[PDB]
Amino acid sequence: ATSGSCKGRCFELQEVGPPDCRCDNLCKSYSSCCHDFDELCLKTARGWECTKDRCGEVRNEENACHCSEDCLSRGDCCTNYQVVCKGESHWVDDDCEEIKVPECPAGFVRPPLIIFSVDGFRASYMKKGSKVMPNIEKLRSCGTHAPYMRPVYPTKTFPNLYTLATGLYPESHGIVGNSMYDPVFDASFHLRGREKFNHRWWGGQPLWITATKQGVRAGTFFWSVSIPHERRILTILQWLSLPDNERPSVYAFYSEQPDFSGHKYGPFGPEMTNPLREIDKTVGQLMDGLKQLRLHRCVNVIFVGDHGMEDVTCDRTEFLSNYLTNVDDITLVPGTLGRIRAKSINNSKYDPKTIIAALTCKKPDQHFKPYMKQHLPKRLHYANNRRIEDIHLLVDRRWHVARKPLDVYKKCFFQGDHGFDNKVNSMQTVFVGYGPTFKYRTKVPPFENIELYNVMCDLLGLKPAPNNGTHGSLNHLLRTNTFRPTMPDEVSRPNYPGIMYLQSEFDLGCTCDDKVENKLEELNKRLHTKGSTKERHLLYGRPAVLYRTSYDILYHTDFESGYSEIFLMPLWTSYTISKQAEVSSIPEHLTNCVRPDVRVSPGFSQNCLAYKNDKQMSYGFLFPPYLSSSPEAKYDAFLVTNMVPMYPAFKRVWAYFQRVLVKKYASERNGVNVISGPIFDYNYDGLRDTEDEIKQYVEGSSIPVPTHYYSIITSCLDFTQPADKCDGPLSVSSFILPHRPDNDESCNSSEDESKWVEELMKMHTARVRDIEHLTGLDFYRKTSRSYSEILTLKTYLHTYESEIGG
Numbered sequence: 001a002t003s004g005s006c007k008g009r010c011f012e013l014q015e016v017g018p019p020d021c022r023c024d025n026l027c028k029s030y031s032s033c034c035h036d037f038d039e040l041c042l043k044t045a046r047g048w049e050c051t052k053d054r055c056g057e058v059r060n061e062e063n064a065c066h067c068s069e070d071c072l073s074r075g076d077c078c079t080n081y082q083v084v085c086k087g088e089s090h091w092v093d094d095d096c097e098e099i100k101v102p103e104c105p106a107g108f109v110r111p112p113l114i115i116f117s118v119d120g121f122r123a124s125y126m127k128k129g130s131k132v133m134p135n136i137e138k139l140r141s142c143g144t145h146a147p148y149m150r151p152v153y154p155t156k157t158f159p160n161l162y163t164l165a166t167g168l169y170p171e172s173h174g175i176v177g178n179s180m181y182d183p184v185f186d187a188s189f190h191l192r193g194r195e196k197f198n199h200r201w202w203g204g205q206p207l208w209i210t211a212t213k214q215g216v217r218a219g220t221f222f223w224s225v226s227i228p229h230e231r232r233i234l235t236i237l238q239w240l241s242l243p244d245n246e247r248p249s250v251y252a253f254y255s256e257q258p259d260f261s262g263h264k265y266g267p268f269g270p271e272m273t274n275p276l277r278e279i280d281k282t283v284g285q286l287m288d289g290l291k292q293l294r295l296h297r298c299v300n301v302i303f304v305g306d307h308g309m310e311d312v313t314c315d316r317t318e319f320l321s322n323y324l325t326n327v328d329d330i331t332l333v334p335g336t337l338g339r340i341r342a343k344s345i346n347n348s349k350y351d352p353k354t355i356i357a358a359l360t361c362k363k364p365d366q367h368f369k370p371y372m373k374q375h376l377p378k379r380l381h382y383a384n385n386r387r388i389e390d391i392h393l394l395v396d397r398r399w400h401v402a403r404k405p406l407d408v409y410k411k412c413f414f415q416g417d418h419g420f421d422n423k424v425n426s427m428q429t430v431f432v433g434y435g436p437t438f439k440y441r442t443k444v445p446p447f448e449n450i451e452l453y454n455v456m457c458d459l460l461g462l463k464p465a466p467n468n469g470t471h472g473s474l475n476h477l478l479r480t481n482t483f484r485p486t487m488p489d490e491v492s493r494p495n496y497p498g499i500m501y502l503q504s505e506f507d508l509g510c511t512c513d514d515k516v517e518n519k520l521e522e523l524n525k526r527l528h529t530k531g532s533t534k535e536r537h538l539l540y541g542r543p544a545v546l547y548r549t550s551y552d553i554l555y556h557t558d559f560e561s562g563y564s565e566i567f568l569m570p571l572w573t574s575y576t577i578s579k580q581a582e583v584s585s586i587p588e589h590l591t592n593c594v595r596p597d598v599r600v601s602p603g604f605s606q607n608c609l610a611y612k613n614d615k616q617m618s619y620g621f622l623f624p625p626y627l628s629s630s631p632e633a634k635y636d637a638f639l640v641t642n643m644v645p646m647y648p649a650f651k652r653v654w655a656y657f658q659r660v661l662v663k664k665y666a667s668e669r670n671g672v673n674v675i676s677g678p679i680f681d682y683n684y685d686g687l688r689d690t691e692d693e694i695k696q697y698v699e700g701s702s703i704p705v706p707t708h709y710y711s712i713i714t715s716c717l718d719f720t721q722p723a724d725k726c727d728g729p730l731s732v733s734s735f736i737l738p739h740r741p742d743n744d745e746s747c748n749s750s751e752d753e754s755k756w757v758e759e760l761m762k763m764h765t766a767r768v769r770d771i772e773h774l775t776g777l778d779f780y781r782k783t784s785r786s787y788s789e790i791l792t793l794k795t796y797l798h799t800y801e802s803e804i805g806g
């Protein structure tokens, strides 16, 4: 029953309970508004601006906004009221002055936060549309800004807004796409439709709930599509005139532009100039209204986008029908990404192995690449949810995938889309912060949108719920912090074992041709097994082990590890390759050489027989023999304690990285420090496995098989100084390579490794923070750098895209 009234209740903040008619900014979407909502709460009379002739008018209540004398007192002047009627200047026309301290009216307990979020606002608009966006450009240059901000995958609207709100990856918050099916529910979820209003889709704790539970009041985040933008601004400004005990501290505004147009005209279509002018106009309204209320040096404002927009046309559609004969057995979630499942789970027929193989490298020009989800690059964090179908298609920028052509012509009207991989430049979006708490005229490096929840909590005095941000990593945006991060404590201390075992105690089936054996180089190799060159091979301290386990630090002339007695292989192996260092080969008599380590018992060692009896599984080394400093030191690289299991297919990638690329990187960057190691993520949750989760061992052994291998490659940002003597900031790139028994992912893998290997490594680029989650290690513990800067460094991603931003 919707028979009450909205008289003096327009946009009430406390949504009331059915049946009783609602007057809040969501009632439209629940068809439950009172009959007089429109009349009272959605006035349009006389438009949204004052003219010289409306000035000092007699308050007429039918007007959408007022230019009457009493209007400041009522809190419902038009945004431009002071300008037109009281000879004031527009906010944009004022010079910008640093806001060193909040300048808040009596009663404001804390600077309010306003989040101005724009759909489809591609990063490069900040430069390319600069001439038509004066307000936005003032915010950007007077406040703090990034050249761009990286969205989450998929680069769709709901996954990204709800990531902004929660600090979580879509796999965790549960909104994993524009549309989705959940099997435990048995239900679907669509942009259109009323199913999406049910609470059970929505995980984590969004900002407005974090605020509420901690005593801070929030304006709504969700606005109804049919409430125009100018009313939404006026509503925020009304709310800001409420009394202290009722007034919210955090507000959001959403724009459907420029996404809406961009889908029609493409990102840079001529029709795109006017949407950008409109957004800007709206921003101007807000800032003018803030200045009327004397809040313009009090409020923190965040101008943030959800995703970008790419050029995409109907004729750049790949059809599953041209790859499969069995197209009726499947369902496709289509578009800029693909997700395939069985059409009927009635069937023990449908087979995912065959589907994938039918979509792998089938046409030279193929504009997509199929994946089981757990083999997606780990940086996408797109797998740990039952709503993510096992089969995924990653689509080339600028293309679509559809099931069949009737699907595209009976179920070209579009020149723009989005949803691609979140490293793609076109998909990048924007960030500006302006206000007392933000820095002044400061550029910051690009960052990921998962990090903002933490900062908005900080801006508000809130303790963040657990999230996927690294709290501290964005402290450099803020003039005044309020959160001071500290390093997690080491949980397991290492053992420093000495020589305890005689070769004859080892029965590992391991042999080496090494018995061609001086007071000079016997003091020498004692210093190298104690830790003399550890100052050049371990540059930033030993990683801390953040869980309970048993492990040994092993020192060597050329490298230091790392060594786990539970997993029987290193957790980490560290080494430095200076610009001048030279590559050698594995001499022939040493090809099959594996040596027992006399610091480590037989029972905590790998054995060579298990590899002999395992026909799928070979082995490799974490510190490469190829980069030995001397023929004598090269014997160190063959220790059984440096060995790890590697599929032959994977050894081709790994040897190329070790033999060619490490040296190339040391050339380009003037020395690199490398840390490499294994990763175990059998349950694809992005988190280090306990031993009882490992699904594969080297046959007949307790030697677990890694899902991935990582490397972190550090040098000096100022590359005129060498890696092992760097005075200031560091530069890093990292990867997490999937440990696969075939190279089906690389369509040119039958060519020389120089044509396909490095391309794979780039696809599987990672943040040091990703590796931390996956290993339970903590890196960069002893540097000269501030911890904040190090957290920034740990969140960096090297993307391999060309010149990007705004």
Ligand SMILES: *[C@@H]1O[C@H](CO)[C@@H](O[C@@H]2O[C@H](CO)[C@@H](O[C@@H]3O[C@H](CO[C@H]4O[C@H](CO[C@H]5O[C@H](CO)[C@@H](O)[C@H](O)[C@@H]5O)[C@@H](O)[C@H](O[C@H]5O[C@H](CO)[C@@H](O)[C@H](O)[C@@H]5O[C@H]5O[C@H](CO)[C@@H](O)[C@H](O)[C@@H]5O)[C@@H]4O)[C@@H](O)[C@H](O[C@H]4O[C@H](CO)[C@@H](O)[C@H](O)[C@@H]4O[C@H]4O[C@H](CO)[C@@H](O)[C@H](O)[C@@H]4O)[C@@H]3O)[C@H](O)[C@H]2NC(C)=O)[C@H](O)[C@H]1NC(C)=O
Pocket (backbone or CB within 6 Å): 168, 169, 171, 172, 173, 174, 200, 201, 202, 203, 204, 381, 384, 385, 386, 465, 466, 467, 468, 685, 686, 687, 773
């Ligand atoms: C990114 O960030 C996130 C957030 O930090 C990280 O995700 C977190 O990671 C934790 C470890 O994986 C995980 O802990 C689990 O949680 C189980 C219960 O979790 C429920 O409660 C959560 C809390 O909500 C409350 O929060 C505040 C306090 O913070 C309260 O005041 C409020 O009242 C809140 O209600 C809740 O968020 C969580 O939500 C998920 O599940 C819902 C499903 O209905 C979804 O709606 C929602 O979207 C979430 O979905 C994600 O997470 C689930 C897993 O939780 C996952 O399946 C989905 O794919 C999706 O991705 C829950 O409702 C708890 O029971 C777990 O404990 C088991 O294991 C431990 C091992 O030591 C044992 O001690 C324990 O016995 C137990 O085992 C038992 O169960 C086993 C298997 O089930 C069984 O074999 C065994 O025999 C036992 O019976 C464990 O602690 C967090 O829940 C998770 N949080 C979120 C928000 O996802 C994430 O890892 C980060 N990512 C990276 C890459 O770093």
Ligand SMILES: CC(=O)N1CC2(CCN(C(=O)OCc3cc(Cl)cc(Cl)c3)CC2)C1
Pocket (backbone or CB within 6 Å): 115, 117, 161, 162, 164, 165, 191, 192, 221, 222, 223, 224, 225, 252, 253, 254
């Ligand atoms: C169903 C549909 O087509 N649409 C819902 C839609 C997006 C969500 N809307 C919003 O006001 O959102 C503001 C907002 C900001 C931020 Cl930072 C985070 C969230 Cl979760 C929401 C309402 C309009 C577009």
Ligand SMILES: [Ca+2]
Pocket (backbone or CB within 6 Å): 680, 681, 682, 683, 684, 685, 686, 687, 688, 689
């Ligand atoms: Ca795991």
Ligand SMILES: [Cl-]
Pocket (backbone or CB within 6 Å): 154, 156, 176, 177, 178, 179, 333
């Ligand atoms: Cl989707």
Ligand SMILES: [Cl-]
Pocket (backbone or CB within 6 Å): 649, 652, 742, 743, 749
């Ligand atoms: Cl191969």
Ligand SMILES: [Cl-]
Pocket (backbone or CB within 6 Å): 549, 566, 689, 690, 691
């Ligand atoms: Cl363990």
Ligand SMILES: [Zn+2]
Pocket (backbone or CB within 6 Å): 120, 157, 259, 260, 263, 418
């Ligand atoms: Zn869109």
